Amino acid sequence: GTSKLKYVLQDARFFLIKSNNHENVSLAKAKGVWSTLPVNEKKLNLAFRSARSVILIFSVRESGKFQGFARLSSESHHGGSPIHWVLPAGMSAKMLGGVFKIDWICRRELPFTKSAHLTNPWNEHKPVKIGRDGQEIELECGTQLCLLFPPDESIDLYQVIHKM
Ligand SMILES: O=c1cc(C2CC2)[nH]c(=O)n1-c1ccccc1
């Protein structure tokens, strides 16, 4: 069912995350981590202290889909185990901010065709698929977007709830 998911999303904040490729989303799904550029790192750290849940909704560039969504479990930190991200041309690992721990809520994909009825007030009511990395998605739009994803029966939200 969807009741524990709705509980996790209650009064959450939501951010669109772009990945240049599928490899980085695969690494994020396996290791429970993400890293963004410093401008977005500052926004996410502020949000993490501001709200009961901060949800990252992932989309690989040019894929026409979202690849899942996850909840921040920490502010960003430096000096942890190395992660062999595959970054875009002209970007080095030193340009990244720190590493956020994340707990995946759904590792299933959602094609953009299924979200065409949702618009984001914080991006001029453009379709929610449209946005730069780090674009905040307003609560109602973000909640409805997450509820569109296929249920991920491999995930037990009981432990995620205990972190809130
Ligand atoms: O492409 C990537 C790949 C990553 C991986 C470390 C996780 N993190 C990012 O933030 N980007 C990004 C998105 C939009 C604009 C500039 C960079």
Swiss-Prot record:
It is found in: Nucleus; Nucleus speckle. Changing F66D: Abolishes RNA-binding and ability to influence alternative splice site selection. The modification Phosphoserine is found at S81, S92. Changing K18L: Does not affect ability to influence alternative splice site selection. GO terms for cellular component: nuclear speck; nucleoplasm; nucleus; plasma membrane. Changing N24D: Abolished binding to N6-methyladenosine (m6A)-containing RNAs. Coiled coil: none annotated. Its main location: nucleus. Residues 12-149 form the YTH domain. One of its GO terms (biological process) is primary follicle stage. Tyrosine phosphorylated. Changing R132A: Reduced binding affinity for N6-methyladenosine (m6A)-containing RNAs by 100-fold. Regulator of alternative splicing that specifically recognizes and binds N6-methyladenosine (m6A)-containing RNAs. M6A is a modification present at internal sites of mRNAs and some non-coding RNAs and plays a role in the efficiency of mRNA splicing, processing and stability. Acts as a key regulator of exon-inclusion or exon-skipping during alternative splicing via interaction with mRNA splicing factors SRSF3 and SRSF10. Interacts with SRSF1. Interacts with SRSF2. Interacts with SRSF3. Interacts with SRSF7. Interacts with SRSF10. Interacts with CPSF6. Interacts with KHDRBS1/SAM68. Interacts with TRA2B. Interacts with KHDRBS3. Interacts with EMD. Interacts with RBMX. Interacts with ZCCHC8. This is YTH domain-containing protein 1. The gene is YTHDC1.
